Amino acid sequence: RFSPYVFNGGTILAIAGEDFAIVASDTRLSEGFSIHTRDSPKCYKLTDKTVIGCSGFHGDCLTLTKIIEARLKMYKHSNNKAMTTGAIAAMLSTILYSRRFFPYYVYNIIGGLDEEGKGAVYSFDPVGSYQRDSFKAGGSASAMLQPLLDNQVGFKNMQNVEHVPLSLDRAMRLVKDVFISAAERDVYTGDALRICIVTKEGIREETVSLRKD
Amino acid sequence: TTTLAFKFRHGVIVAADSRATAGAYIASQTVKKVIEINPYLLGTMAGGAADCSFWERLLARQCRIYELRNKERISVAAASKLLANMVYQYKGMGLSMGTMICGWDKRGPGLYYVDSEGNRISGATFSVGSGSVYAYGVMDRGYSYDLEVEQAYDLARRAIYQATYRDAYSGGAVNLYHVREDGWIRVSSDNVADLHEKYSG
Amino acid sequence: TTIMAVQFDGGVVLGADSRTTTGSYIANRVTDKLTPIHDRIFCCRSGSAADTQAVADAVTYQLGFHSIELNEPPLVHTAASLFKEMCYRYREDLMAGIIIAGWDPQEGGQVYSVPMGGMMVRQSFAIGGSGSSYIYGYVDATYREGMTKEECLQFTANALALAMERDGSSGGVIRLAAIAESGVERQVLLGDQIPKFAVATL
Amino acid sequence: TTIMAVQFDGGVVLGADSRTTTGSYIANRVTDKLTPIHDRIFCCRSGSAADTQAVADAVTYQLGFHSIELNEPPLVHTAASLFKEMCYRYREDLMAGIIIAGWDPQEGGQVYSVPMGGMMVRQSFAIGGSGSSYIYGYVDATYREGMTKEECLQFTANALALAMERDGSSGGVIRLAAIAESGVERQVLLGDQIPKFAVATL
Amino acid sequence: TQNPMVTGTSVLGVKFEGGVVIAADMLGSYGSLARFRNISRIMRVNNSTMLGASGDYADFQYLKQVLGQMVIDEELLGDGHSYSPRAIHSWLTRAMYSRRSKMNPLWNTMVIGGYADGESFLGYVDMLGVAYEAPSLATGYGAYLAQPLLREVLEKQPVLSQTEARDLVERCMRVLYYRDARSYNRFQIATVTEKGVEIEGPLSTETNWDIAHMISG
Amino acid sequence: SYDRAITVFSPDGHLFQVEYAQEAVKKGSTAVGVRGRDIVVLGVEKKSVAKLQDERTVRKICALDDNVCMAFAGLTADARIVINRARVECQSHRLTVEDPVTVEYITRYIASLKQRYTQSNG
Amino acid sequence: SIMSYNGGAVMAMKGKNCVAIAADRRFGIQAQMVTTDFQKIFPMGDRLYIGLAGLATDVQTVAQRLKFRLNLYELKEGRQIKPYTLMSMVANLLYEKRFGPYYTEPVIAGLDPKTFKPFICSLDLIGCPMVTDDFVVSGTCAEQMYGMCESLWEPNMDPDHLFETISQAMLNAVDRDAVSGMGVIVHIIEKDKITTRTLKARMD
């Protein structure tokens, strides 16, 4: 018959620090065994304090992105202020649940700053179940990224090691390392890596090369 | 998932693990499975996380509107009935939801099990989730209405713990809430690894 | 079913077999598959009998009202567009392969194909139906630009004879109709009037 | 696939396209579908490539041993009977449409069809494969008793060209082979050597 | 559309210096039958954009009608505004996603090419609403056969002339005619420059069949 | 359907239809009620004592539920409507909420109903 | 899936003149854990171990029949088996059931009993061999293990570092898998000795 879904691949990562938030993704858009494009990032700047990563079915990613934009503008018109990160998270939850019986095939991770200036990460399921996290990976290579981050950022299973907070520098090199490993083992992850850094200064974008096979 | 709740002389004990899986993969170990609906209403999360969270949030909204309109706070029974009636209209559509609504009322400590299937029953002890069978084993062996508060806490914590031990889809941390006449208090949030060393040696 | 339409200078030529089957049984061995849509516009039907009859009636109705309201002889392309609209809008509920052909003072003799999908294309010649499959080659090797009316007549007659010989869902009698500014000339080839071809012996 | 065999006085003529597909992809655009079974006995293969190759090899083996044991040039009917036996006995496990043709000092030039069922029939001419459907009419209107060898050559060439033009599972190059007491004359028609037909324009 | 009927195969597209070129054969196939061997699967959508379609031809005709009406409706105003290629691409994306979400899709895969404001545009739109931009595009078997060639060139020489692009396109179409059983040796090439949209008539691909005589050895 | 504004504002800012309704009430049988400690009593005046009439069929004191009773004054038919609607709502309250019904709640329902009829077309 | 019915994880890692092999200890039936001391690593001679994950029955059965054939080998020939040879032997054993396979994906880790050169490999359920110079994994948390091993493994590691690495990899990979864990065991083997440890692990 006819299937309204197709898996487009993509990996997505987000880390929350004391004064920063990282939202990274690969740039490969794939279908089946083919590459649609090597320049298609999964990161979207929403506000000056909030970025969202969307992985999964590309059509739903696009649609959801545009819906979020429109609704941000609407909240601004209606309240004369911009949406906080938490507000965007909650609104996203409702938007995702409105399609409870015909879901967006999208894994979302929001990264940004709260109103105290602290780093905030929100992770979602396709129907809008969402929680707050220190760090979260979603997408095809999620199961490869998550355990290392649990080790190097959460210090799990490590005996007599100091619990020093994550610095931006270390976080950046961590993101690069995990995406480099994922590009080795996941056939969906590769081509390039876009990193979005969120601080009080605004949003930085960095691009690192990954292997093209 | 393993959740339990029981009412005794001093209120309602509510406990839950914190693991969430997607197949065999562990998606999270930091899930708040005790839902703070109100300062006076607790829910639990079993089945679909989204369904429980969304519908009990809608419940919270309705309860607040109720408090504004009638200048009084909803009863546990009316809240559970509200939730059950809301969920019943989507019967057969695929909602997965097993929750326990806990509170304190004009009738005293209230505890209702509410299903996505349509069930809504009052009772003394309940346990919901893939680990419920294991939690029932210890909870039933230890339960008394005349338990002391510390005894109650230890019982709930141990039940959830043993459940984490046997059930592959349960683990992470044991969270524990206490519902008293003046509202609920967040009692504890111990990690399973700590509880292992506390209990075994 | 085997339907066919060839365009010439002064107009068009239509041909169809006369077999309508329900399974292997022939419910009608003498079907009229050339259906007048207007004074000089015909359609060749193929597929579900109910569907094609209903659609043809509807189009005849619409086109009649349209032509009265414009006070002009309707365009062949217009009838074809009406068929196209119906057959495309209800493509999942209709089983119809139509060939609209006729004459028109503005564009002359024309043939349009409206196959099962609901697309529409103008062609020099068109074939349709189960039997058409067997005469694609012949019709490709026999066609020639600038045929006379009688040549097109003999052409469709031959092609249809071949198809009817090979296809089990095709047979019976041959119905032909020439259309031009002159008018409509219908005829029927039966029995020995139907072209024969030397059958292999030894 | 489109295969074809025409019998004339001094012997036979074989023709086949060269397209072998797995789905819509062409795994081989230059396949040899005319397979020598003996010195003057060929087979045209259609259907599963594995099946037809295996069967052809087996028949070649059996017929070789047979001809050595009899010390005579084998009958075409014998090769055909071997193919018939295999294709009928394993009819539920094979997907093969074969045309056995060749020359034989006892009965001359002959063509036999062994379709998917496993039946066997001698014919003046035979066609097979997916593309054959499109040239039944042509081949019926073009055939004529008492064709010369070159006439049969041009005949099969034309028919195959038409089929290849219409059938998606057919195409590539044309392979011809004339067989007579003289011997085997194989040739290949490619590109512009392949007969063309005037395509409809306006 | 639930069951596509008459269909067209691959559509090619490549950007070059100050323009875009798109290629597509003139065949409408009815299953395996090459039924309609003279249809155009390329539309001119105003002066700065053009469209090529794979998939169901009837749905393509529908889209052609709707788009045509949109262009006309816009040009009626004459307000010094016109749909950019990116805008047509956006609209088409929204349309395909909408139909997809109604479980009644338009069975098409489309390549939109355009030139406006000194920049080349090349967009891909799915029947599920999967859309993106790329310097080279190939639908269907072109995605397996033509696209590796196109990418091979464009990652060794990102900037092509119109001639290099046209040659590349001819080679790709040739490969497709070799390996795609639902293609036809008769195609169209459409080009957008600042001078507008040009659709060059029926072109044939030269073929080589020497390997026909490499059976024995 | 009938979509016409019946109740509208007058230049002096009065809702005339509502005032006329209140006049209609003013033409009604006198009804009084008093609240005690463990008792509450309501009494209605002129029962239109025709004596040829069954009193039971013309009582102006109804019960809404086991918990709540009510008297009225005005147009008896309108009263019948409002009363029965109030009864339905009294039961629906028990359905939707395990607890019965408070007097203020049903009073609020009836009041809102009337207000709704002061501001709806037709 | 059949492989996920009991779950479990097995990993092997190359070092300098040493090699390591590890496995979780859980035996469970779907969601329910039955035992926490299930053996998944079996000695097939001095300095040569095999790790079996998947369907517990076939773990035990493949192990047993393997020991059968191995003992016969070491009797007919007057030598302990070479690692490559053991790999080919297992491959043969598994491919004998090509159309009704054992549901196990074995991992082999050992030192050449003549030299000391470390050897690791893994096989299909139907015995397709794969040798690497870094690490091999098999189990329900394969992606996790890949993730850890790609980020922690260095080339020329000494016994202690090989230990720490394989231990952290196993622990952190297993702790993101519901049907793997309940303890971890590590055999680190070198020329002179064999160290066997059980790790401090989560039990949930």
Added chain:
Amino acid sequence: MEYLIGIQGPDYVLVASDRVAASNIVQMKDDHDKMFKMSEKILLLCVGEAGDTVQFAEYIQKNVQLYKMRNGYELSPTAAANFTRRNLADCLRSRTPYHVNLLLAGYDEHEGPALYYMDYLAALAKAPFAAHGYGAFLTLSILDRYYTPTISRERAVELLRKCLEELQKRFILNLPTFSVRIIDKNGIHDLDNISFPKQ
């Protein structure tokens, strides 16, 4: 799984139900009540699907109470039974049918005691005694064996005990306790629970 039973005497109706609310392999409640008061002299014993039982039963209940408040008098057990049967029958071919099996016990001042049996298909049948559930298959025969139309309520309770004991003996499901009520001229009376002190 749920058990209902009703026995009609000359001037009384005896009813009993199991007190287990079960899900999966566990008993979640052991003091569950299957009965619903609908009037001063009418009981509705409802059993079946999870949400349908309570929804349907309570709907009927509030409608009967509504009738009482609107008209001053109560419905007869017959009018009630036909009312629930009409409601159940109208929803049968709708989008939202109710999977409920039910008994209706009642006492009328005129026609006397009544016991009604209702299938989930909404077939209404008056009977001297009836039962619902798997346990019925083991109990009905006993009733058939020992029921006489002039049975005293004492003998009725004894007979009930026989049935429940049989349930304890042959039935694989637990069912340790039973709600027992009786309806007569004076209304609904609660009797002591029939229990079997297992543990």
Added chain:
Amino acid sequence: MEYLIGIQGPDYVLVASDRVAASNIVQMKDDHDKMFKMSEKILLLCVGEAGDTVQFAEYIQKNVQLYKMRNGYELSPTAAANFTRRNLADCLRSRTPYHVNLLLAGYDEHEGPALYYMDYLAALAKAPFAAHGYGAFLTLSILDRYYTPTISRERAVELLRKCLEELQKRFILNLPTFSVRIIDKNGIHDLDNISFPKQ
């Protein structure tokens, strides 16, 4: 549905099983024995499919007895367990597989008390305590909560009682009586049946 349980002490093995043979909705037997003596110090607790349990169990039994008669000494609980596991594993991919879950209790003069757990897939696992059936889901945790490796047989029986009482409380299936045996140095001893006088 069937319940098995085994608890290993320092010098004894305690085993218990339900005594219900059930079919459909009825208990057909209430004194059914799930245990099989295989040696003087070995018990086999078998459970599962209708014919497979007895066929398999008895096959194993007669083969163990055969070993004893052929060699003069008995099999060890370990050798026995691996024997049944081998037989069960060989039939797994055959035309005639056996749907049996089993416990093997034993006492060896050398290695001491032993308790083995076997899945129907023939996975063999030695354990300090184990259980089979739906009831296990409600009992294992209790054992986990209260088991210590140095548990006395008296305390073992008490613990067993706790588990069975829990079964009486939460389990929907009846199960009123339980076979209880114990194995030590002196052989197999029958203990009084744990029962709950329902009716």
Added chain:
Amino acid sequence: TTIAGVVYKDGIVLGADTRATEGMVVADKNCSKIHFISPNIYCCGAGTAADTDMTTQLISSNLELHSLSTGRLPRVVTANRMLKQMLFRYQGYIGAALVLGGVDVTGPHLYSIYPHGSTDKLPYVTMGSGSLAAMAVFEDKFRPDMEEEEAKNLVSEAIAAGIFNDLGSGSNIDLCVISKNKLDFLRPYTVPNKKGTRLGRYRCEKGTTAVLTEKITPLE
């Protein structure tokens, strides 16, 4: 997997990639897909890995027996026959897709062999998930009677096309050149893919892993 083969003036060039995937996860980055059949005959394998392994090994063995008995060098037709008959006998249940190439007394010969047992003798062939890309390269840049380095370049180009355009393919490129008097088994003719250098040192120090139990066993 992307494997290819071509016939040039002096013999045959075989090519393969080196990625082995389990599902959509790379298991092997350096898989060998070019198999020894006989000293003059080699075979690239795609499809079910174990099946290609065992098929190719079995045929190699039987061919060694054959040449040992005949005292002559094996022919490519022989390998083709053995393979295709074995494969046909199993009706596609043995998932071996093969590119068979070698040099005989009759010269160079290249066959493609499908798991059902059909074969094709062609100057250039491709098999695997990346076969269409490689085939595109061939159909664009192949000429008869090429020279050695030209042929190697063409094949490596086709394998590269597959590597970069197919998710099933990746890593290195292996070539095997077979001429009337030479055999160049270039393991990795090319490493166009590299892991990015580690930015961090995630090295764990001794003692960071908690241990419950230890047991040292001395050997010999």
